[PDB]
Each structure stands twice: as C-alpha cells, then as structure tokens.
Amino acid sequence: DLIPAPPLSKVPLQQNFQDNQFQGKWYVVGLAGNAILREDKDPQKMYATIYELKEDKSYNVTSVLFRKKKCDYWIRTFVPGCQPGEFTLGNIKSYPGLTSYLVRVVSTNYNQHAMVFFKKVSQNREYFKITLYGRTKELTSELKENFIRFSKSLGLPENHIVFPVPIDQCIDG
Numbered sequence: 001d002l003i004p005a006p007p008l009s010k011v012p013l014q015q016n017f018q019d020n021q022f023q024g025k026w027y028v029v030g031l032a033g034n035a036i037l038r039e040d041k042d043p044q045k046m047y048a049t050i051y052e053l054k055e056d057k058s059y060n061v062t063s064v065l066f067r068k069k070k071c072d073y074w075i076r077t078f079v080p081g082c083q084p085g086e087f088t089l090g091n092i093k094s095y096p097g098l099t100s101y102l103v104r105v106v107s108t109n110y111n112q113h114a115m116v117f118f119k120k121v122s123q124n125r126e127y128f129k130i131t132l133y134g135r136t137k138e139l140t141s142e143l144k145e146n147f148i149r150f151s152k153s154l155g156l157p158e159n160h161i162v163f164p165v166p167i168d169q170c171i172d173g
Contacts, residue, residue, distance in 0.1 A: 003034040005126035006154035011117045014105050017085030019057060021110035025050045027171075029139045030132030032151040032161045033118075046137060046164040048171045051078070058090065064170050071170030078103055097122045106150070111135060113143050115150065130154070137166040 026049050047065035054060055059078035064071060077090030081102070089101035099121040108114035114133035119126070132139065132147040144163065151161050 002125055002127075003155055003160070005034075005119060005128045008104075010154055011104055012106050013083065014085045014107055017083075017105055018110060019053055019059075019080075019084070022105065022108060022114070023051050023053050024135070026114060026133040026135065027137050028131050028164055029134040029137070030144060030147040030151075030161070030163050031129070032131075032147070032156055033127070033129030034156075034160065035127050036129060036160055036162060038159045038162055044162050044164040046166045046171060049133075059087065064173070066167055066170045071173075099124075106130070108133070113139055115147060128154070130156075137171075 028047050028049065031044060045066050047063060049061060049063040052060040052062070057080055061076045061078050063074045063076075065074065066072075078087035079090045080086070081088050085105035087103035089095075089098065089103075092098050092101060100119070101121075102117075102119040104117040104119075106115040106117050112135050116131050116133060117128065118131070119128045121127070130147070130151050132144065148158075148161055152158075
C-alpha cells in the first residue's frame with residue numbers, strides 16, 4: 001500500500017523566495033510523508049541538512065545524519081525549477097529509475113523555520129515527504145502544530161508524522 005501523493009494545488013509556495021537567505025544549515029524538527037513511519041523500535045533522530053548556493057544559482061544540499069553509530073553525509077544538487085522556491089534533483093539519471101523529483105519550499109522566514117515539500121516518483125510509485133526545517137533544534141509548539149495540520153491536509157495520518165529526537169553528534173558540526 002501507499003498513500004496517494006497530493007495534487008500540487010494543496011502545496012503552497014513562498015511569496016518571494018530568497019535563494020541567498022534560505023542558505024545555510026537547517027535542522028529537521030518534523031518529518032512526514034508516505035514511506036515514513038513511526039518505527040518506534042528505532043525512533044527517527046534529528047538530522048541536519050545544509051544548503052549551499054552556487055554560482056549557477058543551484059543548491060549543493062548536504063544532509064548529515066547519524067546512522068550505525070557514524071556520521072553519514074548524503075549530498076544532492078537542487079536545480080532551480082519553474083518558480084522561485086521550486087527545485088528539481090540534479091543528476092537524476094545517476095539514481096536508478098528516478099522518474100521525477102520535485103522540491104517546493106512551502107513556507108519559511110529564513111531565520112527560525114522552513115517547511116519544504118518533496119515529491120519523488122520511481123517505478124510508477126509516488127512518494128512524497130514534508131520536512132519542518134529549523135535554524136535551531138527546537139521550534140515552538142505553534143509551528144509544529146501547523147506542521148501536523150498541513151501534513152494531514154495532504155492525507156497523512158498521525159503515525160506518518162514524526163518529530164525526530166534532537167541529537168548532538170554529526171549534527172552540530
């Protein structure tokens with residue numbers, strides 16, 4: 001089974017996206033989407049994702065995570081899309097059978113919080129994810145409540161909405 005992906009009309013986009021201001025390190029305070037479950041045997045740990053603007057105006061997206069007692073660094077490129085705040089994955093063919101990948105910055109203030117929508121399609125299965133970004137490891141319950149409400153607005157139950165636990169190593173570096 002797989003929860004259907006939301007039509008893009010239900011995914012807002014930031015008023016005037018600032019590529020330079022969105023730069024820097026972001027903390028994953030909230031995680032949601034299909035293929036993301038509350039596996040309480042291994043609760044998700046907070047991972048940080050750094051965006052670096054390049055000359056071509058694309059992003060070098062470095063995600064740092066704590067997996068298997070070691071710091072793993074997963075690197076992609078976000079090629080700008082149709083409108084500011086929208087992106088497509090760079091070197092799509094390098095990933096086996098990545099039919100499409102869309103990134104849409106739903107909302108941000110660039111100083112404390114951001115909310116981004118990712119849609120990935122492979123082998124005719126639609127996978128989508130919503131992440132609650134934070135410049136620190138903690139956000140107020142108001143923005144988290146908005147994150148839960150927005151996630152359910154795309155057809156997401158509560159067991160598919162996860163708040164990764166803050167951790168220190170690999171993530172504050």
